[PDB]
């Protein structure tokens, strides 16, 4: 059941804007780990003395990576007269958000048919505003409201390449790296309480439960009218026997923020076997793969939609396969991106749903719980 | 003339420690660009709740990388019970230091016979102490000095891999990357005042100057008894036409810091090979290469140290020479390390100067900015 109740147009989602230390450290990191092109510039080069901002892409994935100059360099300057290129930026609050969270996710973007009348109405039906309304070069308007924690939902429209005051990057600095990534499928909050976290994101937008189908957490998903922006929220479950991994963000994070990003990859295959090639060489690391006998188990639960020989492929790279009632999905996570056990990363295929491919095609995975706490059992008795 | 005056018992240097915003992003962007292997960590999996450290090496050549942790996971801990493997480490000068000059040099580590001793004489010699003697272990004594800006001179001396509380990394995420890097030759500084940050350092180490052969700085560079410790120092050239880059670094950095490592390679035509074949993939980048005017004079100057099919190897990889009288310099410099036009590589081989071959055969290259000035008015002749 799928209400359509957007309160304003929402397109797709637009861009991820990481909040650094170093930009320029942490984009060539996942350039090169994650096969993204340095596609723009926001920088002292381009005059911009307030912060400088590296956009990298791989088909329609948008990675912005943002740090702070020393503000001696913009002394002067006051709003109207500021250099920077993306005008909610403040330099206590990149500080303030780094030292409090390390390396993460500032800005979940989404592309909206008017930025102003999103933040208007967002905040007229309860969303606390971050940064309101401003247009760049009469083009593109920007207005931002909080998410969960530090993260705010930016939202973006155009009148008619990424943000007037970025450059194109020249080509020779520009490598045309490409492992098959092509959109962000989907990105996770970790809360403390869901339920609070739910009522107010799906208070101010409209987005509807997406609905789903006993170790770690509560999950829900909301989503947009056509179901291709996603965001699926977590709380910890309290009191297990092994603490919950949600828990261990929230105390590592200093509180609520997102959790991962989900990539869809036109050919997972190649995107894993890519991206694991350069793991000890500056890439990503993967989760442990899961027990032989996981896949063993795999022949009878998708076994007509993958062939055999595309099963021990699966086996080879560690993808995990879970299934819907209308798709299955393909998936695998990697570590903590950053020093600390906070965000990371998913790569997922979705196979099935055609009508285009409807989005959440196969869910997301929740069914590979009990499917790996059977695989351990199996495994321990063919010891 | 080497009048040997060192205050204390100085070997090598040891390795120099970066002051990071995410450790784990600039540590491994280091290891693709330069071929550095992860050798060692301290963090969260070792025990450490307090920063994450991350060794890389190449040689004899050890880069660390540390970040802070939230300070919460380590709340209850007092300095006697600290679970840092750095004990000079503090949460408040790491964010103090890291939001004031971004990413940089902390620490320059020289490792001696005597660190208590060391410390003991330098401070009665006018050092600024920064971190008294700790011994670790009972088996390493690390101490620390002010050496200028927020830069210390950490002295570390061993009983008898790197330090206690430091883990060998496991071989399956230690790849064996080497492009023929080797050690620290020197390590270069940028003050606003070349006379007194001089008078400072060899009041209190005895270094002595090490003495040479119009346009940017000026400079002097202090040495041990070996001449295998070499730290020069920069000082801006005011009212000139074209500002002086020492200037623009020390506005940059917000004051005096380390401006440039020298890494000596034992093949400086592979390391510039496989560092240029990265520059686009998340590697390094270097700086504009001389105009082939320059090449055009390099055999009336070292025709007699290189071949014809050298010299043009030197022009495809846009490598300098100099020569002194003893030896001849190979060089390149990269483009800034980080967002900020302050620090930098140089990459160094030597050729000359043997008895082992003895510290800073062929200077430091401060006869390439006559020549680059002639091969610009030459190649202009040309035009
Ligand atoms: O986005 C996700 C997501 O990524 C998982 C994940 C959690 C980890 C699971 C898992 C990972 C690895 C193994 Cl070996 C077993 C299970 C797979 C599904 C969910 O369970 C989920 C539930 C509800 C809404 C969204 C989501
Ligand atoms: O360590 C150095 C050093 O690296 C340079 C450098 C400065 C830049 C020069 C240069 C670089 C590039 C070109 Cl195209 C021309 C000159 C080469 C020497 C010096 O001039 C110097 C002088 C005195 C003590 C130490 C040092
Ligand atoms: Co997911
Ligand atoms: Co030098």
Not at 249 to 268: F, K, T, V
Request: with cysteine; glycine share 8%.
């Amino acid at each position: 059941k799928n209400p359509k109740s957007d309160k304003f147009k929402v397109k797709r989602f637009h861009h991820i804007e990481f909040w650094c230390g170093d930009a320029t450290n942490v984009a060539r990191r996942f350039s090169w780990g994650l096969g993204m092109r340095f596609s723009a510039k926001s920088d002292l080069s381009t005059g911009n003395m307030v912060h400088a901002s590296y956009l990298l892409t791989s088909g329609d994935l948008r990675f912005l990576f943002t740090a702070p100059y020393s503000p001696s360099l913009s002394a002067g300057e006051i709003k109207p007269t500021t250099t920077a290129s993306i005008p909610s930026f403040d330099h206590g609050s990149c500080r303030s958000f780094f030292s409090s969270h390390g390396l993460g996710v500032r800005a979940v973007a989404i592309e909206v048919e008017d930025a102003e009348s999103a933040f208007s109405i967002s905040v007229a039906n309860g969303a606390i505003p971050s940064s309101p309304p401003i247009v760049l070069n009469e083009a593109v308007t920007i207005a931002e409201v909080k998410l969960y924690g530090d993260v705010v939902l930016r939202y973006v429209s155009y009148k008619a390449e990424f943000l007037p005051g970025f450059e194109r990057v020249e080509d020779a600095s520009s490598f045309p790296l490409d492992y098959g990534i092509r959109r962000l499928d989907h990105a996770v909050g970790n809360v403390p309480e869901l339920g609070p976290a739910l009522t107010y994101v799906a208070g101010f937008t409209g987005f509807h439960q997406f609905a789903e189908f006993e170790s770690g957490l509560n999950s829900a998903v909301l989503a947009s009218n056509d179901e291709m922006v996603l965001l699926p929220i977590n709380e910890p479950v309290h009191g297990t026997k092994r603490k919950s991994q949600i828990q261990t963000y929230l105390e590592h994070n200093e509180g609520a923020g997102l959790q991962h990003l989900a990539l869809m990859s036109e050919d997972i295959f190649r995107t894993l076997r890519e991206m694991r090639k350069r793991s000890s060489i500056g890439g990503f690391d993967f989760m442990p793969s899961p027990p032989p006998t996981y896949y063993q188990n795999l022949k009878k639960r998708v076994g007509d939609v993958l062939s055999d020989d595309q099963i021990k492929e699966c086996e080879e790279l560690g993808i995990l396969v879970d299934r819907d009632d209308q798709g299955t999905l393909l998936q695998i996570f990697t570590k903590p991106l950053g020093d600390r056990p906070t965000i990371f990363i998913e790569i997922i295929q979705r196979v099935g749903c055609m009508m285009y491919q409807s989005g959440g095609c196969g869910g997301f995975g929740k069914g590979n719980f009990s499917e790996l706490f059977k695989s351990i059992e199996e495994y321990e008795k063919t010891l």
